[PDB]
Design a binder for this molecule. Sequence first.
Ligand SMILES: NC(=O)c1ccc[n+]([C@@H]2O[C@H](COP(=O)([O-])OP(=O)(O)OC[C@H]3O[C@@H](n4cnc5c(N)ncnc54)[C@H](OP(=O)(O)O)[C@@H]3O)[C@@H](O)[C@H]2O)c1
Ligand SMILES: NC(=O)c1ccc[n+]([C@@H]2O[C@H](COP(=O)([O-])OP(=O)(O)OC[C@H]3O[C@@H](n4cnc5c(N)ncnc54)[C@H](OP(=O)(O)O)[C@@H]3O)[C@@H](O)[C@H]2O)c1
Ligand SMILES: [K+]
Ligand SMILES: [K+]
Lengths: 339, 339
Amino acid sequence: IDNAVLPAGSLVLVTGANGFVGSHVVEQLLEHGYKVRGTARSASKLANLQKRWDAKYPGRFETAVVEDMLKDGAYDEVIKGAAGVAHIASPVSFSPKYDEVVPPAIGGTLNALRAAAATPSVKRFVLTSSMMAAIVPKPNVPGIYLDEKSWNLESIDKAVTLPESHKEKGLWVYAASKTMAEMLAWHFMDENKPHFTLNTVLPAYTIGTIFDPETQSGSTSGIVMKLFNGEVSPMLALFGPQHYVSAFDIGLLHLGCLVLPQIERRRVYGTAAPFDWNMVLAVFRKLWPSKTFPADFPDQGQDLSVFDTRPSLEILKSLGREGWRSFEDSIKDLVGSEF
Amino acid sequence: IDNAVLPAGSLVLVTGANGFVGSHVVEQLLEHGYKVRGTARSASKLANLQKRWDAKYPGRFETAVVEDMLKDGAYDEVIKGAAGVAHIASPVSFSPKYDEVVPPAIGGTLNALRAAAATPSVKRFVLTSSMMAAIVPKPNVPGIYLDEKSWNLESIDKAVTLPESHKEKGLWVYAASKTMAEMLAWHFMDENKPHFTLNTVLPAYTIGTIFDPETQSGSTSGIVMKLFNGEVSPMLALFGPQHYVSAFDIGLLHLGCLVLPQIERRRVYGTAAPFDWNMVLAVFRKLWPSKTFPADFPDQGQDLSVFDTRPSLEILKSLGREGWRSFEDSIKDLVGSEF
Ligand SMILES: NC(=O)c1ccc[n+]([C@@H]2O[C@H](COP(=O)([O-])OP(=O)(O)OC[C@H]3O[C@@H](n4cnc5c(N)ncnc54)[C@H](OP(=O)(O)O)[C@@H]3O)[C@@H](O)[C@H]2O)c1
Ligand SMILES: NC(=O)c1ccc[n+]([C@@H]2O[C@H](COP(=O)([O-])OP(=O)(O)OC[C@H]3O[C@@H](n4cnc5c(N)ncnc54)[C@H](OP(=O)(O)O)[C@@H]3O)[C@@H](O)[C@H]2O)c1
Ligand SMILES: [K+]
Ligand SMILES: [K+]
């Protein structure tokens, strides 16, 4: 990569490397010549991915353990030697228990930033936020435009005021955890003025290859894979209308945030285009014409939101892409094709 | 009051009227010729204050009951006929249990704002926030200036990340509850554009008369009264050097926010000057030479924070005052003098 601000072969700390998005961020860092120390809550959580990366990128990936992101100094040992940090770990269980989701989301973010601020080698930091840190869209509302000043303050209300029993409690607790963790990351930069540059990535519903189906749920792509196998996840209905994005493109957006000089202090939307669950089923039938799939769901509208993707497309074009990877190619990365 | 936006004799709904700050807001509204409907979770919580106000301002105060301010429509009956609303009720127990403090603070605020938005007679709404929605000051830190753009983002971190066992957990939980409730109040105005104007009051440590010591703890002034009687409250150690304000002045600031035409969309600091507990004890010894008082506490130094009090002083001057009521007079309002 020309003009890369982290020299070739530099070490990047990636937190939550056993997770779905984290494994794609690790993959693209390794693919572009960087060494990676990936954290997980246990060595066994990364065992299969370590075997994959040892075979594909020999001697470039290393496992590191961080069991609790809330303990003080959680990342103080794993940060040593790193030129960049990608903080991707956060609770995505959709648990309705506020105290189980919001404190690790905020605590992990701030412990990672504090470790980076105390480590002179760290020059760049990328935080995985979410499109939900800006908005949880409603069906068919024209004229909504989201940009780097958009914040989901509605989620702060709903995460605390909805009863624990509400069917959407977990979704709103999750959105508030992302909103507050990202707000506090930018405030940390303003207050402490550390010697590294921050960028954030805000993915939409991420679709792509599950590298290790044996010990990776696959998050959003695991829900899609369950539907491919005829299982309607209870979590599927706990989602409103929205945009998709390729997991491969999300890997590239984090890489660009870590190494491109023209991307500084940005909130990078990973939002390719709207989609619905009947478009997913239509692509399954096209890719696997012999297979039986669930019947179409009722029409659940469309997300008409428009995002300021200028830095997102600047990153993809600087890293050799023509634009966003298509919805059909993103689903094919996950479920393949019959022929 | 000349040029008042709420005509003379208008009705103002005051939530949490049995509380310390709420009873002073009710007192100054009644003193300036407005009718007040004050709410409490039971009629007995307001019985003694109702007796006071019936004797001092006959036929001007009405008790109203709002048992639960978190549920939907909680303020739907008490809002009828109101030209102004002062929302004062919020948890001030300093409990370290986040889920017992933050949800009623946010939920009560938003439920009052939604009731006001649905009621065309409501022209003004004043929310009691806190100086802690901007900052929890650290000792002897120079150059900190708080203005209408200051927000206590540090409290959002500490309220969730500190363990429940931390000595300051309750203080940070309380500061976050004020910070989030007031942020969501301004967001509500921006999102819904209702036909009323919001102003907020951010008091410092409020000192003044406890009107009904039999059924009012007196909050901050109750801690001062315990110290006057020789008792060091366990909560006193949570209040280090910080600013004080007269309870009488806080009553006037809410009155100005409800009725002065020149105060709109403002965050009004109720911050008179720094104080420390040794200054409180020195005033006690001066006012009561025959009583013994506790020895001085360890000199923790002073709060050096400076607040933008330009709208606060505009309100006090418009309501006939020269400026802030002094520290010695505020303490004398609570404990009197020996002769
Ligand atoms: N998938 C999407 O479409 C999408 C969209 C927007 C943003 N994101 C963000 O992407 C990041 C990764 O999520 P994902 O979708 O890849 O889900 P995932 O596969 O469940 O990965 C989540 C990662 O976070 C770790 N983690 C969760 N709770 C933790 C805790 N309490 N302490 C330490 N580590 C913890 C998990 O480790 P364990 O295995 O040990 O639990 C895992 O490594 C999150 O920040 C998420 O908000 C994802
Ligand atoms: N005193 C100060 O120095 C100071 C400084 C800054 C801001 N404030 C603000 O002033 C307001 C009043 O507090 P205060 O100092 O006057 O304390 P207070 O004397 O204890 O009064 C608190 C009031 O809030 C009500 N309340 C508390 N939790 C409630 C709940 N869950 N549901 C309904 N009502 C509830 C109380 O009613 P119950 O008796 O029914 O519990 C009472 O009316 C609060 O918003 C506080 O943050 C006070
Ligand atoms: K990839
Ligand atoms: K008063």
